[PDB]
């Protein structure tokens, strides 16, 4: 049986680089393809970037209990979420699975699939994070203050997770995750 790992953390912090490394380290890693009801952009392959389904079917799947999690996107313009069946099918086939979602999504997935292992990817310190949120200082004080506030709230609830990986160094963050996914 493949391990299922749900990767989340602070919302203002992109994890695509970490995801990219894991996929390079674990050759047969199945990165969860979210379902969505928005249309494909050119270059997007159905079954690879998303599973593109229409609003009516997405609702069916909600009603049948077939999303581990879902959400309204851009205030309900469309929906996206994680399909249960591919995740379980991959796992039973023995392939390891990584799901990368926001915090509400990971919380929701722990309920619908409790054998999944949730991981909060934490900053090495509050100051490391703060520095990155201020960044180049191209945003307004109001916006930055909101980010810093948002971040402290999110950091304060990392204890809801099965596991904390402190991202001190990319390669050892990635090493800890590899261990959870196959070790």
Ligand X SMILES: Nc1nc2c(ncn2[C@@H]2O[C@H](COP(=O)(O)OP(=O)(O)O)[C@@H](O)[C@H]2O)c(=O)[nH]1
Known binding-site residue numbers for ATP: 9-16
Rounded distance between C-alpha atoms, residue 180 and residue 114, angstroms: 15
Instruction: State the minimum distance, in angstroms, from the CB of residue 41 to ligand X.
Output: 8
By CB under 6 A, tell whether 80 contacts ligand X.
yes
- Sole window of 18-26, 74-82, 128-136, 137-145 interacting with ligand X (rule: CB under 6 A): 74-82
> Which C-beta is closer to ligand X: that of 80 or that of 118?
80
- Sole window of 17-25, 99-107, 109-117, 140-148 interacting with ligand X (rule: CB under 6 A): 99-107
- Are the C-beta atoms of residues 20 and 173 closer than 8 Å to each other? no
Among 8, 18, 58, 82, binds ligand X (CB under 6 A): 82
Using CB under 6 A as the binding criterion, the count of chain residues that bind ligand X stands at 11
3-class SS shares of the chain: helix, strand, coil, % to 5: 45, 20, 35
Binding mask 28-57 for ligand X (x = CB under 6 A): ------x-----------------------
Bridge partners of 82?
Answer: 69
Among 12, 19, 21, 71, binds ligand X (CB under 6 A): 71
By CB under 6 A, tell whether 105 contacts ligand X.
yes
CA angle 122, 105, 30 (to 5 degrees): 80
Rounded distance between C-alpha atoms, residue 55 and residue 76, angstroms: 11
By Cβ distance, which residue is nearest to ligand X?
A: 34
- Sole window of 97-105, 121-129, 133-141, 158-166 interacting with ligand X (rule: CB under 6 A): 97-105
- Are the C-beta atoms of residues 121 and 7 closer than 8 Å to each other? yes
By CB under 6 A, tell whether 9 contacts ligand X.
no
φ/ψ of 124, rounded to 5, equals -70, -25
Strand ranges in the chain using DSSP code E only, listed in sequence order: 4-8, 30-31, 35-36, 51-52, 67-73, 78-83, 97-100, 117-122, 163-166
Rounded distance between C-alpha atoms, residue 2 and residue 181, angstroms: 8
Residues that bind ligand X (CB under 6 A): 34, 69-71, 73, 80-82, 101-102, 105
């Amino acid at each position: 049986v493949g391990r299922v790992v749900v990767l989340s953390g602070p919302s203002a912090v992109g994890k695509s680089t970490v995801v990219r490394c894991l996929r390079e380290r674990i050759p047969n890693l199945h990165f969860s393809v979210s379902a969505t009801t928005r249309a494909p952009r050119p270059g997007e392959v159905d079954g690879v970037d998303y599973h593109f389904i229409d609003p009516t079917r997405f609702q069916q799947l909600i009603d049948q209990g077939e999303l581990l999690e879902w959400a309204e996107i851009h205030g309900g313009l469309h929906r996206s979420g994680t399909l249960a069946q591919p995740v379980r099918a991959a796992a039973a086939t023995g392939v390891p699975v990584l799901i990368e979602v926001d915090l509400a999504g990971a919380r929701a997935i722990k309920k619908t699939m409790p054998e999944a292992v949730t991981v909060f990817l934490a900053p090495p310190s509050w100051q490391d994070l703060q520095a990155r949120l201020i960044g180049r200082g191209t945003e307004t004080a109001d916006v930055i203050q909101r980010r810093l506030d948002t971040a402290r709230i999110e950091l304060a609830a990392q204890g809801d997770f099965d596991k904390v990986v402190v991202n001190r160094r990319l390669e050892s963050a990635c090493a800890e995750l590899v261990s959870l996914l196959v070790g």
